[model samples]
Target chain A: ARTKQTARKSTGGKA
Target chain B: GSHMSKEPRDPDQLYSTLKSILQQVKSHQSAWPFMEPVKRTEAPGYYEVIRFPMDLKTMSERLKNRYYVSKKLFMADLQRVFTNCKEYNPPESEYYKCANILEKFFFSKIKEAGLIDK
Candidate 1:
């Protein structure tokens, strides 16, 4: 789930 | 460079809006036989500007058919469509000629994004 974590991080952890 | 589907990208969503616009215009046409095309000034009357989709699959397919491989290329094509209307049809005649179809296509995205009040 690296992509998910990356996306969450990119979206300021709100995603 | 050629990765486009001939079939409509999302037939259900696409045709739902397509049918709505078609039915509305057809319904109105019977009462107003010589209906005028929608003007750019009247866009707000026909479309919610904020509801236009940021990532429209229908547009992606349409642009892909013309070899627009990326969002950048698609934006350029959209820009050309916007500017060419000014240069070629300064009075915005053809702009509205194509407006109904464009609006219907984007309506698919509007629905997909769950923006409709329902």
Candidate 2:
């Protein structure tokens, strides 16, 4: 979960 | 990599970027056949430009032994190409030779990537 969340944030909240 | 696992319902959506996870895994087997190597870097930033998904790890175990010979096979083919170009024009002879060397070099890179058959 954290890894996916981090990846998402790295792409911005738009993720 | 969240939606990275999502399934596609519509044909158009599925055709674009939404290939189902199982289907994507099945279909994208050779998507990175071109990713032979990467330059070393001090920081994780290298991952940004030379990104590979976890598939490398996943595929690592399943790769056929023959596929590991990609570099040797490529280089050997290049050697054959060079040997077969007997009547090559002077303008293109050097180009053909360089192309052979380049293919060999590419295979060497693949070997260095630990993807070699031996």
Candidate 3:
């Protein structure tokens, strides 16, 4: 959880 | 390096930006007398490490003297933030109203900065 690996087009993200 | 520091001696000076460009541009990353390494760190939230002075409390220079509509809108958003937050205690967490106003204010500022479409 320390490393913030971003995923492509994931849900639950806000503007 | 031709120096017309004609009558006096000119010792070279090192600035922070110059050190940054040296590493990123030329990849000449070495610790010299003129080069110091620092952490490029940012806070996770906006909390500060130390208390600061309130002497600089005037409206920000960039938006202070802007066109009337722009300045008014900016001040209105700031005032809204103050009004919304002033009454709320920490344990109470209904910040939805403040959040809504802040989101719209953010979008408008981003648009003004040419960072958003239309």
Q: Which is the leading candidate under lDDT?
A: 1
For all predictions, the C-alpha RMSD in Å is 19.4, 19.7, 20.2
Residue-level lDDT of model 2, residues B11-93, one tens digit each, is: 33322221222123223322221122222232134345433322222222223222212333322332322232211312233
- lDDT per residue (tens digit) for residues B1-118 in model 3: 4543222111111111222222221122111101221111221121232121110011222223331124233334333333323222121222323233443544444334322232
- Sorting all predicted structures by DockQ, with the top scorer first, yields 3, 2, 1
Clashing pairs in 1: none
TM-score of 1: 0.25
lDDT ranking from best candidate downward: 1, 2, 3
Q: How many backbone clashes does every candidate have?
A: 0, 1, 0
> In candidate 2 chain B, what residue range of length 10 has the lowest lDDT sum?
B31-40
Candidates arranged by TM-score, highest first: 1, 2, 3
TM-score of 3: 0.19
- Candidate 3 lDDT at B100 equals 37
Considering lDDT, which of the candidate structures 1 and 2 is the better prediction for this target? 1
For residues B3-80, what per-residue lDDT tens digits would candidate 1 score against the true structure?
Answer: 332323354533433333333433332211112222323333322332232212333345434434332343343333
**Candidate 1 vs candidate 2: which has greater TM-score?**
1
> TM-score of predicted model 2?
0.22
Colliding residue pairs in candidate 3:
none
